[PDB]
């Protein structure tokens, strides 16, 4: 991971992208089923994020347990960018606001609008998603140094993409900061979604897969 060029970093992350899946109380079933299937693909994707497989299996488990809902939402926000006012959970599951929980929905919509107004690029998106994976559990020695060294390389990669797009040095640093501050909002949305997920699990209304139940137990 530490010897890849910036262009090589971007191509690796682009190649690792998971596929977009389809869906089939009733709403929750589709959403939980969808999240479960997306998690399985997320694990294969994580194994292709450069530097991730260098970590121990225990550290890999911890990072995915901390990051998985953040990753689901940034993916959701990304594929909803070109549908103002909607969230594209699946190509056949495009939801307007009124179809919601809704507090989470509104925050996801606002993030998509932010991405659209900044004109977030696909190459930038995949860098952001790998940062979420490596950052969201790092604060909870040699292995931590390795994750931080990989994180620095992903920052270099983002800056490289911005310089290649013609941004001045000042615009590069500003746009870098704008992107990373959105990750704080994505953490907030995942925090809120985990709390909702736990309430759902206390109730027996919604069927939750064993993997999801193990994910929820980790929080």
């Amino acid at each position: 991971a530490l010897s890849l060029t910036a262009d090589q970093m971007v191509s690796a992350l682009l190649d690792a992208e998971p596929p977009i899946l389809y869906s089939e109380a009733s709403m929750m079933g589709l959403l939980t089923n969808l999240a479960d299937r997306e998690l399985v693909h997320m694990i294969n994707w994580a194994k292709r994020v450069p530097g991730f497989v260098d970590l121990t299996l225990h550290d890999q488990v911890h990072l995915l347990e901390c990051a998985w809902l953040e990753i689901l939402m940034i993916g959701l926000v990304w594929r909803s960018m070109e549908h103002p006012g909607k969230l594209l959970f699946a190509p056949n599951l495009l939801l307007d606001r009124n179809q919601g929980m809704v507090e989470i929905f509104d925050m996801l919509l606002a993030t998509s609008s932010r991405f659209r107004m900044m004109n977030l690029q696909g190459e930038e998106f995949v860098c952001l998603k790998s940062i979420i994976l490596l950052n969201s559990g790092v604060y909870t020695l040699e292995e931590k140094d390795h994750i931080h060294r990989v994180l620095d390389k992903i920052t270099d990669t983002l800056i490289h993409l911005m310089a290649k797009a013609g941004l001045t040095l000042q615009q590069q640093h500003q746009r870098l900061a704008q992107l990373l501050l959105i990750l704080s909002h994505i953490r907030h949305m995942s925090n809120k979604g985990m709390e909702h997920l736990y309430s759902m699990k206390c109730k027996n209304v919604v069927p939750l897969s064993d993997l999801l139940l193990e994910m929820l137990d980790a929080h």
């Binding site: 399985v40 694990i43 194994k47 299996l57 488990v61 995915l64 347990e65 064993d210 993997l211 193990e214």
Partner: peptide, 8 residues
């Protein structure tokens, strides 16, 4: 538990 096997 499931995540372990899934990563392996």
């Amino acid at each position: 538990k499931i995540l372990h096997r899934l990563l392996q």
